[PDB]
Structure formats: C-alpha cells, structure tokens
Amino acid sequence: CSEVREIVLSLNAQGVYPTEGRVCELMPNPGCFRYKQVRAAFNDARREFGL
Amino acid sequence: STGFPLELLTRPATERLAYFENYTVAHPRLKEVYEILMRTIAEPAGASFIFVYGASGVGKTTLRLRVEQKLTELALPKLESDRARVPVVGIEAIAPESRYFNWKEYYTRALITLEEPLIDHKFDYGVRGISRDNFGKINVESKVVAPALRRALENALIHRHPDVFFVDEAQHFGKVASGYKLQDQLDCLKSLANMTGILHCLLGTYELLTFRNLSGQLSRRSVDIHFRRYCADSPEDVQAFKSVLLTFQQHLPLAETPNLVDHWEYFYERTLGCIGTLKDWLKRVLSDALDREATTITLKDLQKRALSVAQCQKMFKEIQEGERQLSETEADVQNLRSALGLG
Amino acid sequence: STGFPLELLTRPATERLAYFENYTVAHPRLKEVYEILMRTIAEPAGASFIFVYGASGVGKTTLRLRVEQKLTELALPKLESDRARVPVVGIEAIAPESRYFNWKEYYTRALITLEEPLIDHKFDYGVRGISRDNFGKINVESKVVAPALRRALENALIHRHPDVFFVDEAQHFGKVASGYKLQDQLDCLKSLANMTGILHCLLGTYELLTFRNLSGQLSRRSVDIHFRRYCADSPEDVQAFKSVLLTFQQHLPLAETPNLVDHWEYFYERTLGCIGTLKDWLKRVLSDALDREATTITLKDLQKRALSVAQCQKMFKEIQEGERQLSETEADVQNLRSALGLG
Numbered sequence: 001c002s003e004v005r006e007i008v009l010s011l012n013a014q015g016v017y018p019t020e021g022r023v024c025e026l027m028p029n030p031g032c033f034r035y036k037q038v039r040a041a042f043n044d045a046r047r048e049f050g051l
Numbered sequence: 052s053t054g055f056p057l058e059l060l061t062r063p064a065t066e067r068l069a070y071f072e073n074y075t076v077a078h079p080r081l082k083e084v085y086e087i088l089m090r091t092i093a094e095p096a097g098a099s100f101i102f103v104y105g106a107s108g109v110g111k112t113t114l115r116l117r118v119e120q121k122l123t124e125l126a127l128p129k130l131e132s133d134r135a136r137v138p139v140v141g142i143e144a145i146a147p148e149s150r151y152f153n154w155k156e157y158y159t160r161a162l163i164t165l166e167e168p169l170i171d172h173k174f175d176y177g178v179r180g181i182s183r184d185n186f187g188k189i190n191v192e193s194k195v196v197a198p199a200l201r202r203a204l205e206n207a208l209i210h211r212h213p214d215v216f217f218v219d220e221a222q223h224f225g226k227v228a229s230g231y232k233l234q235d236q237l238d239c240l241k242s243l244a245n246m247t248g249i250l251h252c253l254l255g256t257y258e259l260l261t262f263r264n265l266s267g268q269l270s271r272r273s274v275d276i277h278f279r280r281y282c283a284d285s286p287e288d289v290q291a292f293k294s295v296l297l298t299f300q301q302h303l304p305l306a307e308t309p310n311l312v313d314h315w316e317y318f319y320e321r322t323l324g325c326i327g328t329l330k331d332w333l334k335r336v337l338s339d340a341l342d343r344e345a346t347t348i349t350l351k352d353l354q355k356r357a358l359s360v361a362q363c364q365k366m367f368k369e370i371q372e373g374e375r376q377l378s379e380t381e382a383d384v385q386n387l388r389s390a391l392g393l394g
Numbered sequence: 395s396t397g398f399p400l401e402l403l404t405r406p407a408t409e410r411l412a413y414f415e416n417y418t419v420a421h422p423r424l425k426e427v428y429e430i431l432m433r434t435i436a437e438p439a440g441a442s443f444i445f446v447y448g449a450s451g452v453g454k455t456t457l458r459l460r461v462e463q464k465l466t467e468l469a470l471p472k473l474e475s476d477r478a479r480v481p482v483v484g485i486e487a488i489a490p491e492s493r494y495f496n497w498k499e500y501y502t503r504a505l506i507t508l509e510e511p512l513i514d515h516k517f518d519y520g521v522r523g524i525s526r527d528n529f530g531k532i533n534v535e536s537k538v539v540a541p542a543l544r545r546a547l548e549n550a551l552i553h554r555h556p557d558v559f560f561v562d563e564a565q566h567f568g569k570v571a572s573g574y575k576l577q578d579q580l581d582c583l584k585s586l587a588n589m590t591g592i593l594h595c596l597l598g599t600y601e602l603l604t605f606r607n608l609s610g611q612l613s614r615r616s617v618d619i620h621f622r623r624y625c626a627d628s629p630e631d632v633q634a635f636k637s638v639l640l641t642f643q644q645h646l647p648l649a650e651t652p653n654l655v656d657h658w659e660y661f662y663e664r665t666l667g668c669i670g671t672l673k674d675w676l677k678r679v680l681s682d683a684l685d686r687e688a689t690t691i692t693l694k695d696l697q698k699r700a701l702s703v704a705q706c707q708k709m710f711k712e713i714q715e716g717e718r719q720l721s722e723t724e725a726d727v728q729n730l731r732s733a734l735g736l737g
C-alpha cells in the first residue's frame with residue numbers, strides 16, 4: 001500500500017493521468033491489486049488528490 | 052484643475068499613453084446604465100437574466116468591470132465574517148469552432164474561473180473528474196460528461212453564491228445549426244440559474260436581440276437594459292457628446308492643448324456617438340503624436356486612424372436595426388392596453 | 395554606388411543569383427503600408443484584426459517578414475534581460491483536403507509554432523495530451539479534442555503575450571461548407587484574439603474581402619490596410635514604376651546593364667504593376683541569361699519567361715474586382731453623413 005501511494009504521487013507529479021494500468025506498469029508484480037485493500041489505498045490516494 | 056496633471060509632460064511618452072489609457076469619462080449614458088444595472092444586481096427579485104444590449108464600443112465591458120470592482124469593494128467588509136463566498140464571477144462566451152456552441156467547454160471554464168479564489172478553501176464536489184493540481188489551477192478531465200460538469204458547477208455555485216454571473220459576448224449563444232431553436236439554449240441557462248439561484252447578466256451587441264423575448268417564462272425572468280449611443284438628432288445628446296469631447300481634450304497629455312470640439316461633426320461621423328470608439332481613436336492619435344513627439348493634434352492626424360466609411364456604414368446599419376427593434380413608443384403601450392382590455 | 399557591386403562580376407553565377415534574390419527595393423507603396431502596419435501594431439487600441447488586402451505579387455509576405463524582423467530587433471534589447479516572451483508569432487493558414495476548414499489543425503500548428511522558444515521554458519497548459527517529447531518537440535496526442543487545444547493555446551498566448559499573431563494566406567479560412575456562414579469563422583478567431591488579447595493580422599489576396607465588414611463588432615475591431623498596386627491611369631504611379639524599373643535595371647548583376655525603362659509598357663503588361671511579379675520575372679530572366687552567360691538581357695529573353703496573356707487577364711480581373719470594393723469616394727462620405735443626419 002505504501003508503494004501504491006508513492007507511485008500515485010510520482011505519477012500525478014508529472015501530470016499524466018494515474019490509472020490502475022499505468023500504476024501496474026510500474027510494479028514488480030502487476031497483480032497485487034487483487035488484494036482488496038491495495039485497491040482501496042489506490043482509490044483513497046486518488047480521491048484525496050481529486051482523481 | 053479639471054485637466055491632466057502638468058507633471059506628465061516631463062514623463063516619457065509611455066507614461067502619458069498609460070495615463071490616457073487608464074482614464075475613464077463618466078458620461079451620462081454610462082452613469083445611468085451603471086445605476087440601473089447595480090440596482091438590478093443588488094436585488095434581482097425573481098429575475099434570472101439581465102440583458103445589457105448596446106452597440107460595439109458603447110462601453111459594456113468597462114461597465115461590467117466597474118460593476119465587478121464596486122461589488123467586490125462592497126463585499127469586502129462582509130467577507131471578514133462569511134468566508135468561502137465569491138462576491139462576483141464573470142466569464143465570456145466562446146464563439147465555437149464548430150456549428151454548435153460547446154456547452155461542455157462553457158461548464159468547464161465557468162467552473163475554472165468560479166472555483167479559483169485560492170487554495171485555502173476546498174469543497175469536494177460530487178464528481179470525480181474536477182480537481183486542482185500542484186500548480187494551483189483546476190484541471191477537468193476530458194472523460195467527464197457534460198451533465199456531470201453541470202452538476203459540479205451547480206454545487207460550486209450554490210456553495211460560493213456569487214451576487215451575479217457575468218457572461219460577456221453573450222451573442223455567441225446564437226451559434227446553432229439549422230433546425231435548433233434559440234429558445235432551447237436559453238432554457239439551458241435558465242434552468243441552471245433557477246436550480247442554482249444565481250443571477251446571470253448577459254452583455255452583448257445587437258446580435259443578442261435574438262434572445263430578447265423567446266417565451267413567456269424567459270420574458271418574466273429578464274431585465275432589459277439598453278446601453279445607448281449618442282444621437283445627432285436630439286440637441287441634448289449632441290451637447291453631451293461635445294462635453295465628452297471637451298473633457299477628452301483637457302485630459303490629452305500634450306504640450307499644447309488641441310482644439311477638438313470644433314471638429315465634432317467629423318468625430319461623430321466616424322465614431323457614431325460611442326465613447327469607446329472615440330476613446331480608441333484618440334488613443335491611436337495620441338500614440339502617433341507621441342511617436343513623432345508632436346505638441347498638438349491636427350485634423351489630418353485624426354484622418355489617419357479613422358475607421359473607413361464602409362466600416363462606419365456597416366456599424367450604423369446594425370445600430371439602426373438594433374435601435375428600431377428596441378424602440379418603445381406610446382403606440383405600443385396603447386396597443387398592449389387595448390389587447391389587455393384595460394380601456 | 396547606385397548599382398550592384400562591381401566585384402560580383404568575377405564571382406560565379408550562384409553568388410550573383412543569390413545577391414539578386416536577397417536584394418529588396420523600398421518603393422513608396424511598400425514604405426507606406428509598412429508604416430501603417432507598424433503604427434497599427436504598436437497601438438491597436440481596441441482592434442483585434444488587421445486585414446492586409448493586396449494583389450497576388452505585391453509583397454504581403456515580404457512585408458510580414460520585415461515586420462517580424464523589425465519587431466524582433468526592437469524586442470531584443472528587452473529580451474536580453476526579460477525572458478519567457480515571444481515578440482511576434484507567425485502562422486500560415488492551410489487549405490484543407492476536405493471541404494471544411496480544419497480548426498483542430500490550426501490550433502495544433504499554432505501551438506507548435508508559438509511554443510518553441512527554448513526547452514528551458516516550461517509552462518503548464520492545463521490540458522492532458524500536449525507535452526514535449528524526447529526530441530524537444532511539441533507533440534499533441536490525436537485524442538485531444540479541439541476545444542482542449544484551443545484552451546491550451548489561449549493559456550500559452552496569454553502567458554507569452556506576443557505583439558501580433560500573423561496569419562498569412564488567411565483567405566483559406568473561407569474554405570467552409572455552403573451552409574456555413576463566413577461570419578462564424580471570423581467570430582471564432584475574434585473570440586480567441588479577444589480573450590488572449592493578442593492582435594491578429596490577416597494577410598491574403600482580394601479573396602479575403604469576403605471577410606470584410608461581416609458585422610459591426612468585426613468592423614470596429616478591424617483596421618483595413620490596402621497593398622495597392624501601381625496604376626497606369628495616374629502619372630504618379632507610372633513614375634514610381636519607372637523608378638523601380640530603373641533601380642532594378644541598375645541592380646541586375648550583368649556586365650552590361652539592360653535598358654528596361656523603354657520597354658516599361660511590356661513589363662507593366664505582364665506584371666499589372668505589382669512588384670513581386672516583376673521581381674520574379676527579372677529573376678527568371680537573369681537566371682537564363684547567366685546559364686547561357688549572356689552579357690545583357692534581350693527582349694526575347696523577357697518573352698521566354700514572361701506570363702501568358704491568359705494568366706495575366708485573370709489576375710487583372712481579380713484586381714479590378716478587389717479594387718472596386720476598396721475604393722472610397724466623397725459620395726460615400728456624403729451618404730454616411732446623410733444617414734447620420736450631420737448635414
């Protein structure tokens with residue numbers, strides 16, 4: 001979850017739209033979102049930032 | 052005195068040009084329109100639309116800026132108690148690059164200008180797309196549908212509650228394809244102004260007259276204000292134009308004050324009585340005079356930066372049609388009373 | 395001296411050809427049109443459009459190049475310290491492959507041309523899709539919709555505040571559908587030019603007169619400049635044409651200067667008095683003369699590379715049609731006064 005938040009930070013810094021696929025492209029195991037709190041953390045980080 | 056300060060003669064030509072550009076004349080027409088518009092804004096009382104008709108160069112935009120400034124000044128004392136409350140927000144309609152006016156872009160830009168006081172306040176609109184960024188500017192994703200943007204704008208407008216919503220160049224709302232009724236695009240704004248409760252002031256030229264009276268609902272919730280030019284038939288308007296010209300001549304930053312009232316016919320001919328056009332003409336002539344470092348204004352110098360006869364004829368034709376459409380006489384009142392059966 | 399340097403005679407034909415190509419002559423019409431254009435650019439004063447009508451071959455493009463160069467030279471002392479500013483940005487309208495003018499491509503190419511000052515200058519467009527690639531070039535995603543590109547261009551133009559947005563070959567704006575009004579295209583350009591506050595200069599041939607005086611708002615914010623040709627019906631233009639022929643004949647890089655003044659009727663016949671056409675004709679004739687290594691220029695050489703009578707009879711008809719609508723007489727002034735009641 002911590003790397004998920006950090007990756008969404010880094011992706012939103014450059015202005016590119018942070019989506020699930022784009023974040024997955026920057027993970028060693030782009031399948032961790034099947035856990036139902038990694039996705040929750042990603043959604044919370046996006047919604048705090050305004051998506 | 053009543054003229055420009057004499058210290059400006061030693062200042063560079065740029066300073067004199069800036070001073071003349073910033074100068075504003077309080078001629079009777081602008082004053083009266085200002086009082087009527089601010090009285091309407093102070094209390095709309097059911098009306099949702101304000102139509103400020105006028106020619107090109109009468110001074111509609113400067114009137115809007117003056118009204119915005121004075122509204123902000125009046126809301127400054129009350130802003131200390133109730134925060135997150137925009138006093139006035141104003142945008143300009145965009146002439147579309149396609150055959151239809153883009154409502155999505157209108158909503159996006161209205162949201163951008165309205166919801167940018169500063170970063171200290173957050174509202175958390177009900178739609179996911181709209182958000183701020185690291186630069187402090189609102190960016191709206193292209194995937195946000197138009198009804199969602201409309202709902203977000205409605206929520207933001209309800210929260211902020213500006214006194215009036217200015218829409219400059221409202222004649223661009225008439226850019227529709229064949230078979231599309233102009234009434235529908237007016238109800239599109241009327242519904243927003245009704246479910247939101249924010250007065251909308253539409254400023255535009257005589258092309259805005261196509262939105263004058265489209266339905267009974269749109270005629271009830273509308274205030275009609277005519278920014279009128281100066282005519283040559285009535286001696287009072289001629290005297291007002293001469294007074295404005297004399298005031299302009301006193302406030303022209305030149306070493307020797309030019310004589311400018313005597314050539315009042317030539318000015319009215321190429322200006323059509325609009326103070327904005329005359330101000331632009333005098334600004335151009337003053338810039339040329341300072342470019343050569345002249346000491347006065349000569350008739351040929353005015354002849355240089357004068358609008359062509361064809362341009363003036365076109366503007367006068369549209370002014371004639373607009374004034375004919377907007378003329379109210381006792382015959383119309385009597386016909387209305389006879390139709391109402393009030394004899 | 396008054397002619398080409400005598401050292402060029404020993405140089406290869408390429409050097410002489412390039413010297414003739416790069417040579418320019420300041421005839422009275424060009425100097426007058428340049429002074430008018432620069433005075434209008436310096437102080438638009440409520441003008442958002444500058445139409446420069448002229449025949450095909452009068453020198454509109456070289457006038458634009460000269461104005462851009464002189465503006466850049468003026469801004470260079472200020473650009474030494476101040477940065478993030480472009481003095482002048484120039485674009486050329488594109489004739490569409492389809493029936494309708496492509497506004498999406500106009501915004502894309504305007505954004506590309508305007509925003510290439512330096513890789514260091516980074517500014518946020520506020521729209522996702524436009525950025526700079528690995529080659530330091532502006533790339534716009536094909537999924538970016540035209541209103542978004544318009545908003546990005548508006549933000550860039552406001553940020554960079556160029557003095558004038560030149561739009562050459564502006565007659566290509568008229569490539570619109572039969573059901574599309576030409577006033578709407580001008581309104582779309584005027585809206586950008588007004589929210590951006592950037593003066594727009596439209597250069598084109600007499601086909602651009604279809605964009606002349608479409609409304610009172612597009613007439614007041616318009617400064618029509620006519621790049622008039624030389625006419626044989628008045629001795630003054632004939633003398634000017636003879637003088638320009640004299641300086642051209644004395645600046646031709648040849649061992650023996652050809653006598654061009656005697657055959658001035660022939661040169662006017664195939665050029666209609668325009669300077670660019672005569673310059674290109676002389677350039678061609680000199681190229682053929684130097685290919686054969688001719689000591690001078692013969693009439694037959696001029697006939698070899700001249701324009702056919704069928705070619706000239708169409709350009710001359712277009713010039714007549716354009717000059718008919720660009721002529722102002724005292725009768726028009728009296729009609730305007732009578733309409734305004736100023737008699």
Ligand SMILES: Nc1ncnc2c1ncn2[C@@H]1O[C@H](COP(=O)(O)OP(=O)(O)OP(=O)(O)O)[C@@H](O)[C@H]1O
Pocket residue numbers: 072074075076077078081106107108109110111112113114255256326327328330331439440611614
């Ligand atoms: N009362 C005034 N006193 C001084 N300057 C004025 C006045 N009214 C307008 N101007 C000048 O006119 C210019 C702005 O144009 P103006 O506000 O008259 O146009 P508008 O009629 O509202 O707009 P549009 O022509 O697009 O419909 C500015 O240079 C401004 O200084």
Ligand SMILES: Nc1ncnc2c1ncn2[C@@H]1O[C@H](COP(=O)(O)OP(=O)(O)OP(=O)(O)O)[C@@H](O)[C@H]1O
Pocket residue numbers: 415417418419420421424448449450451452453454455456457598599669670671673674
């Ligand atoms: N005053 C001038 N002195 C010298 N050469 C000139 C002058 N005006 C134009 N030319 C030359 O004429 C040629 C073409 O003219 P130019 O491109 O300026 O015309 P234009 O008005 O833009 O034409 P068009 O509308 O047909 O595209 C060029 O080789 C240019 O150098």
Ligand SMILES: [Mg+2]
Pocket residue numbers: 111112219
């Ligand atoms: Mg305005």
Ligand SMILES: [Mg+2]
Pocket residue numbers: 454455562
């Ligand atoms: Mg050209």
